Structure formats: C-alpha cells, structure tokens
Amino acid sequence: EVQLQESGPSLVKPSQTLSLTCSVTGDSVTSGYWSWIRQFPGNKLDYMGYISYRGSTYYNPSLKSRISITRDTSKNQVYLQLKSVSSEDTATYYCSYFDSDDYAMEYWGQGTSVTVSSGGGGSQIVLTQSPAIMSASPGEKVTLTCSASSSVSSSHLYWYQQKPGSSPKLWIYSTSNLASGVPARFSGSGSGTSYSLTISSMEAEDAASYFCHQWSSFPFTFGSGTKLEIKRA
C-alpha cells in the first residue's frame, strides 16, 4: 500500500552537499512520518530525522546544523540534504514511513548507497547487543538480547531482521508483538533496560542480522546488532 524508493549520487566529494530523493507511491496517507535512516559500513544504523504529515521536522542533534528534510507533496517526494559531508557520511541511505496510529507496521525503501570521496549537543540511549555474532544449529532454541543504557518504554522497543542486500524489516513491535510476515516461532520479552528475542526452534531461513531499536526517547536509536548464522558446512 506504500512503496518508497531512494535516489541520488552514489559518490560525493568532501565538503560537498549530499542530496537524496525519496519517491513515495501507493495508497493515500492521512498522517504519519517520513524518516531518513542510514546504515554505515559495519551495519550500524543511524536515525537522521523525519518530516511529518504536517511538515513538522525532527533532526538528530548530531546532524542538526548540516541536515534538512523537506517535502514536495505535489510530486509525492521527500528530500534529504546533508551539508559539509566527510568520509564519516559514507553509508546506505533509507527513507521509511511510519504511522503512529499503527505501531505494527513500518515501510522501508530499497536504500541507496553513498560514499564520500557536530553543532548540536544532546543525549541518547545506547542499545547494546551481545554477542555481535552467533552461530546455532537448526532446531536449537535461540535467544538474542538487547540492553539499553537507560530505561525505555516496552511499547517503544522494536526488533528488525535484515539479510544481505536487503533493507531492515520490522520483526517485533512493542517488545513482544510479531509483525506481519514473521513466523510464530519467534517471540520477544523484556522491560526497563533488558529485552530479548527468542526463536523456539532455529530454522535455516532465520540466519540473518537482528537489530533492536528504541523510539521511546529522542533521538531514536538502534543496537549494534547480532548476526545469527547457522552451523554445519
């Protein structure tokens, strides 16, 4: 019902300005937010900011002065402008749509890679995921954990699954609710600063990366992730 597609240069010189476009297609919308999220090499996800249905914007303090998110409703597009880029801005950029009236769904674009040839100040909740890599035999009960540096509302603790060459997919919302498309063998639990995702019985198709995410406090943050691999070569 809602598809997003990012576009723009794949290479930019330092000090130059980065400009990306997100073309939105699908059914009409009566609310919601369009966010820009980037993933650095190593797979760390970074929440950049958003522009709402009413043009209200929020920018991650670490980008505040360099970023601008705008909209051109007549042509159903959202834009991202990041000034004075450096090698630290090399990453895959994704635009995403979310309707706070419906926590169970989130849509992500295909993402577009950008390689480069802190006025703000604030605070953020750090999400730790250990171990970073994990191997399990099919049939094993698997448990992945996520520890927040500060408390977060369980209603705002989400989990995403990502496989190489694909954008993150909403997996669990509000700590223990499975998203559409997720096998019931998955479950989640937790509260305060301690959360977990469990697979009753590891299946081959479950090998992928899993990231926890919190949008209880601004700026929203993502965990470093846990790469789950299967055993037996």
Q: Which residues bind ligand B40 (CB under 6 A)?
A: 33, 35, 50, 98, 100, 106, 158, 215, 220
As a whole number of angstroms, the distance between CA 54 and CA 132 comes to 39
Nearer to ligand B40, 115 or 153 (CB): 153
Least distance to ligand B40 from the beta carbon of 15, Å? 29
Q: Tell me how long the chain is.
A: 233
As a whole number of angstroms, the distance between CA 216 and CA 206 comes to 27
As a whole number of angstroms, the distance between CA 59 and CA 79 comes to 13
Nearer to ligand B40, 148 or 202 (CB): 148
Least distance to ligand B40 from the beta carbon of 135, Å? 29
Q: How many Cβ atoms from other residues are within 10 Å of residue 41's Cβ? A: 10
Nearer to ligand B40, 49 or 202 (CB): 49
Structure token pair of residue 70: 């705008």
Structure token pair of residue 45: 């996800």
Nearer to ligand B40, 105 or 116 (CB): 105
Least distance to ligand B40 from the beta carbon of 70, Å? 16
Least distance to ligand B40 from the beta carbon of 110, Å? 18
Least distance to ligand B40 from the beta carbon of 11, Å? 28
As a whole number of angstroms, the distance between CA 46 and CA 160 comes to 14
Nearer to ligand B40, 86 or 100 (CB): 100
Q: How many Cβ atoms from other residues are within 10 Å of residue 51's Cβ? A: 21
CA 223, 155, 146 angle in degrees (round to 5)?
A: 25
Nearer to ligand B40, 12 or 161 (CB): 161
Residue 74: Cβ-neighbour burial (10 angstroms; 0-12, 13-18, 19+): exposed
Least distance to ligand B40 from the beta carbon of 22, Å? 14
